Structure formats: C-alpha cells, structure tokens
Amino acid sequence: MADLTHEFWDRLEDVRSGMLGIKGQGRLIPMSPQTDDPGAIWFITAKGTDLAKGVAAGPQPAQFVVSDDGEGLYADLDGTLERSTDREALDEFWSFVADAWFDGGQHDPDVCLLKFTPASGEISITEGGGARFLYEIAKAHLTDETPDMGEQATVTF
Amino acid sequence: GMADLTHEFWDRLEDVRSGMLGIKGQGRLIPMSPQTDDDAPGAIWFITAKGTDLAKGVAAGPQPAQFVVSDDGEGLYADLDGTLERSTDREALDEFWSFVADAWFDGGQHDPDVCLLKFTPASGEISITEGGGARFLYEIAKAHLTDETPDMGEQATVTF
Ligand SMILES: [Ca+2]
Ligand SMILES: [Ca+2]
Ligand SMILES: [Ca+2]
Numbered sequence: 001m002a003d004l005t006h007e008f009w010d011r012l013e014d015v016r017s018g019m020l021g022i023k024g025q026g027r028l029i030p031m032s033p034q035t036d037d038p039g040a041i042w043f044i045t046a047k048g049t050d051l052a053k054g055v056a057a058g059p060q061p062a063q064f065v066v067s068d069d070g071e072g073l074y075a076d077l078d079g080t081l082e083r084s085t086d087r088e089a090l091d092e093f094w095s096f097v098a099d100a101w102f103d104g105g106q107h108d109p110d111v112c113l114l115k116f117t118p119a120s121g122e123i124s125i126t127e128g129g130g131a132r133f134l135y136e137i138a139k140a141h142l143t144d145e146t147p148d149m150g151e152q153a154t155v156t157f
Numbered sequence: 158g159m160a161d162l163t164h165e166f167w168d169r170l171e172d173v174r175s176g177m178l179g180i181k182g183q184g185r186l187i188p189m190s191p192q193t194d195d196d197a198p199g200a201i202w203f204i205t206a207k208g209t210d211l212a213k214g215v216a217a218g219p220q221p222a223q224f225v226v227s228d229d230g231e232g233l234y235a236d237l238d239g240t241l242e243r244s245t246d247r248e249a250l251d252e253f254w255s256f257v258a259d260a261w262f263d264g265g266q267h268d269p270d271v272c273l274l275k276f277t278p279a280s281g282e283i284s285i286t287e288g289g290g291a292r293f294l295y296e297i298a299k300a301h302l303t304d305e306t307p308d309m310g311e312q313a314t315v316t317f
C-alpha cells in the first residue's frame with residue numbers, strides 16, 4: 001500500500017547501515033544510506049572501490065538490503081545504482097563522519113556520490129515497540145492467535 | 158587471519174536478533190531470527206512455520222541459500238552463501254526454543270506447524286567493526302584530531 005511506502009522512507013532516514021551491491025558482481029557490502037527532502041538512497045564512497053568502478057560507465061541494476069532492529073525496518077530492494085555529479089546532493093548528505101575518511105573535504109578527488117533509486121522490494125515494518133510486543137505475547141496465550149507485530153508486503157516504488 | 162575473522166563471526170552472530178534469509182532464485186530475502194551457539198559453530202538455526210515459502214522450498218531437500226546480516230550494535234555485517242534444509246534434530250529444536258516461539262506456536266515445540274531450518278554457510282564477505290557506540294564516536298573524533306583515517310576494523314571474503 002501507499003502507507004507502507006511512506007513508512008519505509010520515514011524509518012529508512014534513521015537507518016545507519018545497509019548492504020549494497022551491483023547485480024551479478026561480487027557480494028553485498030555494508031554502506032551508510034543517506035535520505036532527505038524522497039526518491040533515492042544516497043551513499044558517499046571512494047572512487048577506487050568496486051561499486052564506484054562498477055557504475056563508472058553508467059547506471060547498473062543493483063540490490064540494497066536493510067535489516068535494522070532499532071527502527072524495525074527489514075527490506076530487500078531491487079533498484080538502480082549510479083554515479084551522481086550533483087553538487088547540492090553532495091553538500092546535503094556530507095557529514096562529520098565522511099570528513100574522517102576523506103581528508104580533502106566534499107570536493108576530494110577520491111570522493112564518489114552513489115545514487116540508489118529503488119524499483120521494487122519486499123518490506124517488513126514492526127508496528128509498536130516493546131509495549132505492543134509485551135501485549136501480543138500475553139494475547140498469544142489468552143487467544144492462541146499468532147502475534148501481529150506489523151505489516152509485510154511487496155511494494156513497487 | 159582468515160580463521161580469526163571466522164571465529165569472530167560466530168562469536169558475534171549469537172547477539173544478532175535478525176537476519177535476511179532466502180533460497181537462491183526464489184523470491185526476495187525476508188527477515189528471520191538466527192539462533193546459534195558459539196560453543197557449537199557451523200550452522201545457523203531458524204524456527205518457522207511449515208506453510209511458509211522457505212519451509213515448502215526445502216521440503217523436497219537441501220537448496221542453495223543466502224543469509225545477509227547487518228547489525229550496528231554488534232558491528233557484524235555479512236553476505237553469506239550456503240545451504241538451507243529441513244532438520245529433524247530434537248536436540249537443536251529444544252536448545253534454540255524460546256518464549257517468543259511459544260507465542261507463534263500454541264502447541265509448544267511439538268506443534269504440527271513447527272519447522273526447524275538449518276543454514277550451513279559455505280562462504281561470504283564479512284565485515285567486523287567496533288560498533289556504533291562509545292568507541293565509534295571516539296574513533297571518528299580521533300581521526301579528525303590526528304589526520305588519520307578511522308581504524309573501523311577488518312573486512313574479508315571467508316571460506317567456512
Ligand atoms: Ca517514482
Ligand atoms: Ca559470543
Ligand atoms: Ca555464547
């Protein structure tokens with residue numbers, strides 16, 4: 001549904017890490033997703049890496065996987081990864097953590113802004129916190145019904 | 158070392174509450190609860206329903222599978238290739254059974270819908286880091302203060 005897509009973007013904003021990769025090329029690796037305003041997931045990386053070199057010629061079909069317990073967001077997304085030369089996006093998603101890795105600032109020659117546009121994906125969202133979890137377990141013994149911790153669906157972006 | 162990074166994977170995987178599991182060439186990865194013990198490493202165990210796609214997918218026999226992990230609290234990130242299969246091991250079923258499993262399956266561990274799945278990793282690209290707590294904040298702050306890149310941790314492609 002539309003609410004599941006809006007909830008995905010809302011919770012993705014606080015997700016510190018995710019597993020990114022180009023389809024048919026190696027395995028997935030940990031990356032720091034950046035989002036603000038929705039539409040795409042943005043990443044800062046080195047030009048010498050396999051992901052940077054893989055999207056040098058053009059946009060490639062890619063995969064991005066999220067599994068965050070803190071936010072309760074679980075997603076396997078199919079999409080498109082590409083190198084972005086956008087100055088505004090680069091400046092927006094630059095941070096104090098990024099400066100530690102790249103000593104030359106946001107305009108460092110080794111810096112590479114990747115843009116992941118999701119196409120579709122299977123998403124699970126954990127509605128409620130520990131309070132609902134505690135209630136659903138108590139309810140499970142009272143009713144013999146399986147706990148409903150949230151929504152689950154396959155979405156087209 | 159390769160063996161040292163492998164030992165540390167099993168060491169931290171116990172505290173990982175969730176992971177993304179799936180059979181290769183069949184749908185997308187879905188969230189599952191990995192149950193392991195670092196005293197007996199080698200396999201990652203999952204308790205699921207017989208009516209699910211993962212259960213039905215491995216009913217005929219063992220199938221190539223993928224298990225992806227990404228945990229900031231433990232600093233364990235891994236994309237693993239392996240084999241998923243049905244297990245009729247009552248010892249493993251009883252060891253990894255929990256209060257959460259009682260909620261989903263009203264008839265205990267000997268419930269008709271209960272299905273124990275065993276994922277044996279073959280290989281994978283694993284990253285081990287200092288986490289995202291006190292040490293991570295210090296390491297980023299120290300990187301700025303010394304003109305050195307942060308010493309996050311180790312990364313390698315491992316064969317189990
Ligand atoms: Ca669109
Ligand atoms: Ca341990
Ligand atoms: Ca232990």
Ligand SMILES: [Ca+2]
Nearest residue numbers: 103301304305
């Ligand atoms: Ca510096």
